[PDB]
Write a protein that binds this ligand. Structure first.
Ligand code: HEC
Ligand code: HEC
Ligand code: HEC
Ligand code: HEC
Ligand code: HEC
Ligand code: HEC
Ligand code: HEC
Ligand code: HEC
Ligand code: HEC
Ligand code: HEC
Ligand code: HEC
Ligand code: HEC
Ligand code: HEC
Ligand code: HEC
Ligand SMILES: O=N[O-]
Ligand SMILES: O=N[O-]
Ligand SMILES: [Ca+2]
Ligand SMILES: [Ca+2]
Ligand SMILES: [Ca+2]
Ligand SMILES: [Ca+2]
Ligand SMILES: [Ca+2]
Ligand code: NA
Lengths: 519, 259, 519
């Protein structure tokens, strides 16, 4: 059985924790729930750690007193189809392979599934670790509770004796790097310096050997990613988000200075010796928009190249861990600001951005966001009980599963079928424009080889490549983003029409140029 | 927000509690979750209580760390028909009235329903308090959570100015007495001596005015009736059971000495 | 009413049947149930047939005493979508037309439906008989019991007065030949010599006029295809399978000599005069893997060409009726062994194989097969009854319809939803790789005209054609095979990655060569 420790003795050296712990709703929760500090206490001074105390990162550390939240979190939504490749006619991006050619996502890009699986899915996807990590067998794919208990309880490593990124299966890539893991786990929260900069006190950084790093991580979406363990109050821990909101002064709501001030973030830094080491962002309110934006954003988490001169931007560069914190119409400027692109298209040679799940930046300015609605209202609502103590569902999933709580309490004028119909009207319309955007991108792409081989000038090919950047951005934002336009239907529509416009412009340019050479 | 107190200070006088609390699965659970003892600590001696500490008897004292169990407990099974009289042809005892004539159950004996309602059902049944206590209105019958929060949040008393058992409605009885409450609540667990014997330290006993006692009681089937709050270990608190099993030496399984 | 005949008199001339009949569980079943031999008995000697006795091939001959098996067999699964073309974006092979161009399957290749329809579907598919045979009207498509009663009860022939294969509708082919029918019916079991070789006693052979042959056949999947009518014991009758397992010594489990010996097959031959005529394969055990492998295999049942010199291999050749009895990684060697390919691709000119539903050869070596699980365990399980006599379901269908019996009795750790989720994880993953494999095959294919027209050398085009053979094989195995990877997920994954690898290699070869001509 756990035996409580003398927290007051801890506090003689830990005033920062004291001030958080003694004031919040965990004031009575003894350190022994999350820390084994016995040898630490025997060997430390206020200026010397001595033995490193153990800190529990497992979600069960919280489940003991908060089983309902834990259980709701770990639930697997079987209706969220697993390992479903997006580059197929029946998924999100029927022409993705053509359009994304030259990028690692061509190796595999599945639809998201339940949060329990995020770390294991990151480990086993064909694009990440060259097929090194796999589920122990094909039965383990169901095991959300097992994944939560730990990745390495359900996975195997093809070669425990080497730590290099390489291909074990032919059609894989090795895109994973340490920045990725920050959106899969925070098991490394005490072993990773802010932004993954090099640091004397950090075991892990942006430049670590990712296979070695992987082996030290176990749990997905730690409960403390949104909740300070000491104060119990709302926070974020993700460095990239704190960097955008606070360091760069952009605010929690870049488009609304007032809401940014009312629903802000306070950066708190923790030192190792005399040096700043790690940081968290305490939230003014329990604002799920910002909590969820720890991961559901467009980001850099990868090397790339400079727009200016094409040179490599490696993981050692701060730009390899970056939240753009920009909506679709501000993104190109944001990328120019850091002089960065992701890949060169394999067919067109255009420098292109790679977009990822920009839900947070898409939701900005939408009718719901402007009305003070937040991600949790639709995706993790309060439970409604005929008799019971209310709690917040932590099963982050489509509102289709809980429409009464997620939509209909607000939209009293609608039945469930009407509400679903409204969602589907937007998604259907948006998807049509995604498909049309891809048709026109593909049409442009296919003209590049013809143009090149016809002797069209580099000047003209470069003009077309500049069009490709925009045509790509204004399309891929929406295949990346998970709501199929629902989060911001007017923005999706404007963007996709812009993509098509740009592709059409490039198609005409290239066709005319080819025809001129003939011729 | 709760602020923890120094349990070591309590333990100086509360050796029994120390022995239970430090060893079990509530060793990390601070006293402040269930007791407000500041004035008590200021005034008690090793042998005299001083000012009496406040002890939480509400089930929500446990629900903050054990929501799943609490929520499961307070669920109302609507399919368990409410206020369904047993002395009817379609229930358990078609000829009950003839057979039980002379007994107070003739006034009303309904089938049991969900545990959330036990205390309020005890208070309002026609055989218990002469109809003195009633739901505030007929809507309140649904409100399991409400009953759990406290009987007096959903009930009324026909005459707060008197404490005698009497009939307020013609076809009622006044069978209730203090012993009944021991199987409805243990809110009185610190105010009732073992078996309900007269005791200088007990506010309530078998011979108390049951209407006065009732008004002091709020919560059904306290979580601590089966779980020691200090050790978290399994227990019973009901005096009559302890008397049978232990005092009279009959054992937990009187037919099986081994078990 | 049936009147029993004196079987002992039959046995004075039929010792082979005597030895089977008197020993098995049909010892009490009188010959009159399946044979009308009255005039035969009047005219025969032990050395002269006399009048040919009539043998019933209809399934109702068995339904009289085995109604539960019959009724379960004839059930139509309406949820198995009918006449659903595979070459569509929402089915198995979105780019099939491009990839299969030059083969008859381009005319139509639907998904399989319930067994009741196998003979009628064979007759009416657009690729088979030039549209000659059709359902009498579009209502008859539902009529599984009617199909079982007889094909010609539900179909019409556009020209009863001619027997040549020709096109009656413009976009049809005439690929059907007599070998096909062996996987649709065994009504011809007494009229077809082993392998369909020419034989004095055979009315029908590989070289028969298939339209004439068709008109003489009526019933699908005769009950006796798996059960000897005389002994009632387990068997196969399909010549091609007996040829692979026994004649060629490959065994019932080519990859497991021990299991092959425990679960083997004994070839039994029947003579006409002094000459061997037909054969069956008595099974050591009621092994559904081998029973089902009568049809659910990759095969030749068609003319083709020699890999060595391109010459025609006609129906008269033994190779036109062939079970390769080889897994995907052994197939190319197997085809080289008989010096055979199916068609030349219409665009690339590559010699290619045509693969068909290799379930048996795919299932080999899989985790389930290695654990002694067999097709019937998932697709025709025992019925579970609260009160009753157990029997084996003969409704061969997806386990999704009977998950309790097909999966969950073995997988006690799973709910139905979990089991389905595990199936879907594999199928989703496999399908993604099929789609990617097609993308890369299509990309290669499309370069052939460009390369040819640019003046790329035949040497280079031939190198690419050799790559095409492999890229095709390692893809088409999986669109042909019906489990979408479930029967052997690791093999599917390795194969499909190999396809993609080969296509990529060819794409690079061709692009570089085209670019060199320009450059
Ligand atoms: C005698 C002073 C002292 C005492 C008492 C003390 N600590 Fe520490 N603790 C330290 C110092 C110094 C460090 C390292 C700070 C630094 O990195 O500069 C540290 C670090 C830690 C860390 C972070 C370790 C990491 O992974 O980086 C934890 C967690 C911690 N202490 C918990 C506790 C607990 C719980 C107690 C009471 C049970 C306690 N400490 C008591 C001095 C103390
Ligand atoms: C020993 C039991 C215990 C442990 C372990 C525990 N909590 Fe708590 N938690 C509490 C209690 C008690 C409260 C306050 C309940 C109340 O009064 O509303 C609380 C409150 C909270 C709240 C509400 C805070 C607010 O300001 O509204 C959050 C969020 C929370 N805990 C998260 C966690 C997380 C995350 C963990 C794991 C790192 C954790 N808890 C572990 C007991 C615990
Ligand atoms: C800023 C947070 C963030 C970073 C950094 C991040 N991801 Fe993700 N990842 C997500 C989110 C959110 C999802 C779910 C939404 C989606 O897939 O569109 C996701 C989903 C996934 C999935 C499941 C779906 C799929 O694409 O197959 C995999 C695998 C994955 N990420 C791998 C990676 C890899 C490899 C890296 C580093 C190259 C990475 N992630 C970095 C946020 C992140
Ligand atoms: C992605 C951010 C996020 C994660 C991770 C997270 N929560 Fe929460 N949690 C929330 C939100 C949002 C609320 C509701 C805040 C509000 O509306 O007041 C909440 C509320 C809570 C509460 C307060 C009581 C309630 O249910 O409203 C507790 C306790 C809690 N969470 C525990 C946990 C546990 C335990 C975990 C890990 C299994 C967890 N949380 C993980 C976002 C998060
Ligand atoms: C006003 C309600 C609403 C808000 C607020 C909301 N979403 Fe959504 N979200 C939806 C709907 C509707 C869908 C489409 C779900 C579907 O069709 O099943 C969706 C889809 C998603 C999906 C894909 C879910 C799936 O299974 O397909 C993700 C991930 C997502 N939202 C994240 C977020 C994020 C992160 C936020 C806050 C930045 C957010 N959402 C805010 C309504 C909302
Ligand atoms: C401040 C949080 C907190 C409060 C309040 C609380 N408990 Fe617990 N309880 C715990 C923790 C922590 C454990 C140990 C969990 C574990 O290790 O399995 C526990 C364990 C238990 C157990 C399991 C004991 C065993 O030996 O298996 C029971 C029963 C229990 N509590 C009942 C209660 C009751 C009844 C109440 C209200 C009188 C209560 N708890 C109040 C935190 C709390
Ligand atoms: C048009 C409004 C309306 C209608 C329809 C309605 N109620 Fe009521 N009901 C009321 C109001 C107002 C009260 C008194 C509320 C109060 O004063 O506390 C009430 C009281 C009650 C009570 C308590 C009666 C008592 O004597 O204390 C019950 C039981 C009840 N309603 C049930 C129902 C049922 C069941 C239905 C449907 C058959 C129904 N009501 C329809 C408005 C309505
Ligand atoms: C030994 C514990 C015990 C005692 C003491 C006790 N009860 Fe009960 N009571 C129960 C149990 C158990 C039930 C549920 C089972 C049932 O009703 O058969 C119940 C049910 C009830 C009910 C609901 C069903 C009904 O009969 O209408 C009422 C009212 C009630 N009791 C009243 C009383 C009264 C008045 C007294 C004192 C005269 C009393 N109880 C004493 C255990 C007890
Ligand atoms: C006159 C009734 C009758 C007819 C007609 C009949 N059977 Fe049987 N069959 C039996 C009987 C009797 C058994 C033995 C039942 C038992 O004792 O288990 C049997 C057993 C079987 C068995 C089980 C054999 C074993 O060894 O386990 C199979 C398979 C079978 N029959 C197939 C067929 C087939 C196929 C046909 C049609 C060609 C057919 N039967 C026609 C009566 C019949
Ligand atoms: C008012 C009567 C009637 C209605 C209503 C009706 N049918 Fe028919 N249907 C017929 C008749 C009469 C035929 C031709 C029967 C024949 O000549 O054998 C026919 C033929 C058909 C055919 C065969 C068509 C062909 O071209 O061979 C199909 C399929 C069919 N019906 C389906 C349906 C469906 C499905 C519905 C409902 C959407 C429908 N029918 C409603 C009377 C009707
Ligand atoms: C070795 C056995 C075998 C041979 C020989 C065979 N088939 Fe099949 N056939 C099957 C199996 C098994 C299926 C069901 C699985 C599938 O369609 O993938 C099938 C399905 C079919 C179907 C229904 C699905 C579709 O493709 O539209 C048709 C039509 C068909 N075959 C026609 C033919 C033709 C024409 C021939 C000769 C050219 C032929 N079959 C030869 C085994 C065979
Ligand atoms: C594709 C091969 C196949 C076909 C064709 C077939 N069966 Fe079976 N049959 C089986 C299998 C497999 C079993 C179960 C053997 C075992 O597990 O012992 C079986 C079992 C039987 C039995 C034994 C009792 C039972 O149900 O287990 C009978 C009788 C039978 N089948 C009758 C028939 C009838 C009648 C037909 C035609 C409607 C038929 N079979 C067609 C494979 C076949
Ligand atoms: C361990 C169970 C299992 C075994 C054994 C098994 N299958 Fe399957 N089979 C499946 C599953 C699962 C599917 C996919 C069904 C679905 O998704 O609905 C499938 C699909 C099929 C399909 C397509 C069914 C459909 O409607 O899509 C056919 C045909 C098939 N199997 C034949 C066979 C053959 C022949 C064997 C033996 C050589 C075999 N199976 C052995 C599980 C099994
Ligand atoms: C007759 C027993 C049995 C049947 C029926 C059965 N399984 Fe299995 N299955 C097994 C065994 C044994 C394993 C291997 C277990 C191990 O070694 O860990 C297995 C493995 C699996 C695997 C892992 C395969 C891999 O390659 O890693 C999956 C997925 C699976 N089963 C799903 C199913 C499905 C779905 C069904 C129903 C269609 C099914 N099983 C029916 C016994 C069975
Ligand atoms: O690949 N996760 O953005
Ligand atoms: O076309 N049946 O393999
Ligand atoms: Ca999903
Ligand atoms: Ca990006
Ligand atoms: Ca009841
Ligand atoms: Ca089918
Ligand atoms: Ca073939
Ligand atoms: Na094209």
């Amino acid at each position: 059985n756990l035996k409580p420790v003398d927290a007051m003795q801890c506090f003689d050296c830990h005033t920062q924790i004291e001030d958080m712990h003694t004031v919040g709703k965990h004031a009575t929760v003894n350190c022994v729930h999350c820390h084994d500090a016995t040898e630490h206490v025997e060997t430390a001074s206020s200026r010397r750690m001595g033995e490193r105390p153990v800190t529990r990162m497992d979600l069960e550390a919280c489940a003991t007193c908060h089983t309902a939240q834990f259980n709701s979190f770990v639930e697997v939504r079987h209706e969220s189809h697993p390992r479903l490749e997006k580059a197929t006619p029946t998924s999100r991006s029927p022409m993705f392979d053509k359009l994304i050619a030259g990028h690692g996502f061509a190796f595999e890009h599945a639809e998201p599934r339940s949060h329990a699986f995020m770390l294991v899915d990151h480990f086993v996807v064909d694009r990440a670790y060259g097929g090194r990590f796999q589920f122990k067998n094909w039965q383990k794919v169901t095991d959300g509770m097992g994944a939560v208990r730990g990745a390495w309880t359900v996975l195997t490593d093809a070669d425990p004796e080497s730590s290099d990124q390489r291909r074990f299966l032919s059609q894989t890539a090795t895109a994973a790097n340490p920045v990725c893991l920050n959106c899969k786990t925070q098991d490394h929260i005490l072993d990773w310096a802010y932004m993954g900069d090099e640091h004397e006190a950090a075991k892990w950084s942006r430049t670590s050997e990712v296979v070695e790093f992987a082996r030290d991580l176990n749990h997905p979406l730690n409960c403390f990613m949104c909740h300070d363990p000491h104060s119990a109050g709302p926070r974020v821990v993700r460095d990239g988000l704190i960097n955008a909101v606070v360091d760069r002064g952009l605010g929690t709501y870049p488009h609304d200075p007032v809401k940014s001030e009312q629903q802000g973030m306070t950066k708190v830094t923790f030192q190792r010796g005399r040096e700043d080491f790690r940081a968290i962002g305490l939230l003014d309110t329990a604002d799920s928009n910002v909590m969820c934006a720890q991961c559901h954003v467009e980001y850099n988490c990868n090397p790339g190249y400079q727009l200016s001169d094409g040179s490599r931007v490696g993981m050692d560069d701060r730009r390899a861990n970056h939240f753009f914190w920009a909506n679709v119409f501000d993104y190109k400027e944001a990328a120019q600001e850091i002089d960065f692109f992701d890949f060169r298209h394999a067919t067109t040679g255009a420098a292109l951005p790679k977009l990822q799940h920009p839900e947070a930046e898409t939701f900005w300015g939408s009718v719901h966001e402007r009305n003070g609605v937040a991600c949790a209202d639709c995706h993790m609502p309060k439970v409604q009980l005929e008799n019971g103590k209310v709690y917040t569902s932590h099963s982050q999933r489509t509102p289709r599963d809980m429409m009464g709580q997620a939509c209909l309490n607000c939209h009293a004028e609608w039945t469930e079928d009407q509400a679903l119909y409204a969602i589907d009207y937007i998604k259907n319309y948006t998807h049509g424009k995604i498909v049309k955007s891809e048709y026109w991108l593909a049409k442009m792409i296919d003209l590049f080889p013809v143009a090149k081989r016809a002797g069209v000038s580099e000047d003209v090919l470069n003009q077309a490549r500049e069009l490709h950047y925009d045509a790509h951005l204004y399309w891929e934002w929406w295949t990346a983003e998970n709501s199929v336009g629902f989060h911001n239907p007017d923005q999706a529509r404007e963007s996709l029409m812009t993509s098509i416009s740009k592709s059409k412009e490039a198609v005409s340019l290239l066709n005319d140029a080819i025809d001129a050479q003939v011729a």
